[PDB]
Swiss-Prot record:
Gene name linked to the record: dhaA
Oligomeric and partner information: Monomer.
Listed GO CC annotations: membrane
Alphabetized UniProt keyword annotations: Detoxification, Hydrolase, Plasmid
Name this protein carries in UniProt: Haloalkane dehalogenase
Residues forming the catalytic site: D104 (nucleophile), E128 (proton donor), H270 (proton acceptor)
Signal peptide, first to last residue: none
Function (record text): Catalyzes hydrolytic cleavage of carbon-halogen bonds in halogenated aliphatic compounds, leading to the formation of the corresponding primary alcohols, halide ions and protons. Expresses halogenase activity against 1-chloroalkanes of chain length C3 to C10, and also shows a very weak activity with 1,2-dichloroethane.
NCBIfam families xref list: PRK03592.1 (NF002938)
InterPro entries: AB_hydrolase_1, AB_hydrolase_fold, AB_hydrolase_sf, Epox_hydrolase-like, Haloalkane_dehalogenase_2
Catalysed reaction equations from the record: 1-haloalkane + H2O = a halide anion + a primary alcohol + H(+)
Description of what induces expression: By 1-haloalkanes.
GO biological process per UniProt: response to toxic substance
Length: 292
């Protein structure tokens, strides 16, 4: 069975007046591997991947502001909020060079950080990452009505805030295998209080779909252009049918992105880490020393 435990000691750092939680395991020095979750997850998402990497490399996995075990400031939780807190987290830990391992909004954060700090990114492993979705036509049908409703005034907050639809609905609907109740309870814990679900609602409203919001579309286009022109080593995991990165997109990217390896994980929708963590972890571990 895929592991349900979270056997990592909590670490905390004060960031912009707020405490942020992170995992910090493996060697205490050397290039760290920075794992960035997205919506509506936490460092828990990486629990079965980190043990493959920690034998060789320091592993750092923060909980984004307002998520996981991190503090809950009264923010609007726009992408720019997350940018500010993650930038300040990285500086608070004194990180210099990093390897990024990124997913969903963690990928938007990671790629955006890399474009702005290109000399400090030694490699990027990514999966089910955020790219511009030019039309609803390209958003897979099985999840389209949901995300459209998430992005609709009043309806979206009833679903995500009042009814916890991101946790109880979208999350398990984006894993091919069934999540267990222990796993669901780990994902539920930060969000037992409805008001605390603001990040979960703002995130889908930030997705670059059909040209809006235009500032996020621009930001994401900018880092995708950066990624097409960067020689940084890249490792792209993909599943079938996928969500953000369908198989045909993964194959196009394998050709268009420089120095890119693609790994097929088999069945997968969005949270690929919950369907095939062993292959993702073992392949990252095999790939890291090649960043040499
Ligand atoms: Cl596992
Ligand atoms: Cl546990
Ligand atoms: Cl609203
Ligand atoms: Cl398959
Ligand atoms: Mg404070
Ligand atoms: Mg809207």
């Amino acid at each position: 069975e895929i592991g349900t435990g979270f056997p990592f000691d909590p670490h905390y750092v004060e960031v912009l007046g707020e405490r942020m939680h992170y995992v910090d395991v493996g060697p205490r020095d050397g290039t760290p591997v920075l794992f960035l979750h997205g919506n509506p997850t936490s460092s828990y998402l990486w629990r079965n991947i980190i043990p493959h990497v920690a034998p060789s490399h320091r592993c750092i996995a923060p909980d984004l502001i307002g998520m996981g075990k991190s503090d809950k400031p009264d923010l609007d939780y726009f992408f720019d909020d997350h940018v500010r807190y993650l930038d300040a987290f990285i500086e608070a830990l004194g990180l210099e060079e990093v390897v990024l391992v990124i997913h969903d909004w963690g990928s938007a954060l990671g790629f955006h950080w890399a474009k702005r700090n290109p000399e400090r990114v030694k490699g990027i492993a990514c999966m089910e990452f955020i790219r511009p979705i030019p039309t609803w036509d390209e958003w897979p049908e099985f999840a389209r009505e949901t995300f459209q409703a998430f992005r609709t005034a009043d309806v979206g907050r009833e679903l995500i805030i009042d009814q916890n639809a991101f946790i109880e609905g979208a999350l398990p609907k984006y894993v091919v295998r069934p999540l267990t109740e222990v796993e669901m309870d780990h994902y539920r814990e930060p969000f037992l209080k409805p008001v605390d679900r603001e990040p979960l609602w703002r995130f889908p409203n930030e997705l670059p779909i059909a040209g809006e919001p235009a500032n996020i579309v621009a930001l994401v286009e900018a880092y995708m252009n950066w990624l097409h022109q960067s020689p940084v080593p890249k490792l792209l995991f993909w599943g079938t049918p996928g969500v953000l990165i369908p198989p045909a997109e993964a194959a196009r990217l394998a050709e268009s992105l420089p120095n890119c390896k693609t790994v097929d994980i088999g069945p997968g929708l969005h949270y690929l880490q919950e369907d095939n963590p062993d292959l993702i972890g073992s392949e990252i571990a095999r790939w890291l020393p090649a960043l040499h």
